[PDB]
Symmetry: D2
Subunit: 183 residues, 4 copies
């Protein structure tokens, strides 16, 4: 069974694991993690942080806000679009993008992307872009990235069955990034 | 002894500015969050500037979150703007970045000293903020109230309010917020 | 079956429910909620808030800190002690004491207690008191309270199988407490 | 002195006092948590007193948490102490409660003016904090640096540090803390 309680517990435990991590893959707009009920209809069936995850410029990061349903329309769009290709995919987290990192991830994760400059009119970038990457991959990959655009920083989006799986994948990505960030 | 005394003033100033802000219906929050900083007199490097260790971000439930503590060396980004404007007027030691809006900008030009810079002109081997601020000030003839830019590749458009201290800046932001509310 | 992940999720959801509750039974020393792994050996098999739940003078309350194992030796003493009587009891939360409230609760909940003045030497108040209240009851009751003592605020402790159940019990206790307004 | 002590001044003093506290290895935290307050000159009631809406509490994994915001009227409790002491010396506008320790007191009575009151001697229909502060001050012949009490039924003992403003209070507390650290490390 997968009800609201299950989703709130999933995200809570995912955050818990995240607090143990030396997570530095945070974009300028901050990270958020979300998970939906199975077969989500709208963003109200998707839970996330009411705040965001931001860097602590003195070292570490801050996890701001509470987990609540409908807290992130943005990521909800990604999960709702992806669920069309695979209803098992219910979670997503956006993290910082790095050119070198992506190259290295393609040999360890299923990766797909979309170009913001190719967006047609009358659509939501996140809905359109997710659809693009998924159709290109022929399913739901581990990661959906984009090199950004006018007023939009590049981004890496990690997907998975639930928020716990997502964070586990992010940990793998973080370990690789540690070496690059160090350099 | 001297530094201890000057730092205390900076901390108190930033602290009261946040206090005032918390009272406000601050909605001009950019997706990258806002921060507010203030420098000691005659700053040399970012460590002579204090600010939030976190940032001021939106709360989906409504309102906003003021995240972190006020500490020195907490904002290299903002510090770059202040130290650069300080080369045009040592009196300017505080700055805060808020949400950009075309319509609001026009209405601000009639009440504040506004200058700017464009991200595409940026010459190679330079810091965008140091360069942009310097260009914006060279262009204005001193340190204006507002320095904005339309953004660019991977960069959201921003409005930067400057002043003699954090409280000054916050007061200015409150005026701006009001001007902005007559639009929505 | 019942591992650390389960415990963390249980406490997390319990707090989630508590946050949406008009909870006013907060002691002067603040409340904390804790849950242990089955058959806990020491306080490190018990998770709880590293901070506490305290009153917000403006109104409402603040839930401070993170959920972590080994976060509370104090409540851990209570849970470890009760588990000897009934290993199915893995959670506990301390809430504000009220003489009248206890009177009303005694008719709906299984209640027991201990007296700080009767504490024998060379023991831990929480370990000894919990054991005493349970032997007095013939098992583990829903509530174990004490009228406090010198330098010690009186307290009502709510026990249960897991953190969610405990909060569910506190929700009822709170409604009853409100009849006292 | 050309200064005007208004609300802004008080908020700034409390804010800086907290900034200093966050840098301390403050372990003298009572079970009920600590709070720090400061009033405007000649306070009329607790509304003229500012303090944390929450409190300073122990972080079980190590360190402590400063909870809430600084706001006027936040603390009636510490306000009762300040307004009471101000009747003896209007210069006293701040107070912070910290964990009590008998040995620590003895080590302090040589560096600080100390006075106290007994919860068991409290008369009928009075506020413990107003009455106790009054007694302690009348017994000292003024406002001391410290007013403590050994606790009582349902009440943990406490050490209350007073001063002209929050910053002055925090400086005294730091001195006390260093002494306590030695006792702790013995
Ligand atoms: Cl989001
Ligand atoms: Cl994104
Ligand atoms: Cl900026
Ligand atoms: Cl505890
Ligand atoms: Cl207890
Ligand atoms: Cl004990
Ligand atoms: Cl208080
Ligand atoms: Cl006190
Ligand atoms: Cl009182």
């Amino acid at each position: 069974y997968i009800n609201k309680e299950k989703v709130i517990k999933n995200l809570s435990y995912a955050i818990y694991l995240l607090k143990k991590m030396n997570f530095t893959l945070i974009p300028e707009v901050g990270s958020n993690i979300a998970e939906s009920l199975p077969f989500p209809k709208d963003f109200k069936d998707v839970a996330a942080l009411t705040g965001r995850i931001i860097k602590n410029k003195l070292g570490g990061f801050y996890i701001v806000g509470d987990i609540e349903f409908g807290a992130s329309e943005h990521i909800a769009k990604i999960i709702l679009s992806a669920s069309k290709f695979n209803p098992e995919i219910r979670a997503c987290m956006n993290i910082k993008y790095d050119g070198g990192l992506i190259k290295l991830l393609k040999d360890k994760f299923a990766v797909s992307s979309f170009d913001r400059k190719e967006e047609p009119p009358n659509v939501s970038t996140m809905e359109w872009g997710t659809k693009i990457a998924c159709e290109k991959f022929g399913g739901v990959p581990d990661i959906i990235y984009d090199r950004g655009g006018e007023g939009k920083e590049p981004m890496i989006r990690v997907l998975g069955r639930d928020a716990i799986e997502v964070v586990k994948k992010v940990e793998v990505i973080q370990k690789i990034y540690n070496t690059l960030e160090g350099h």
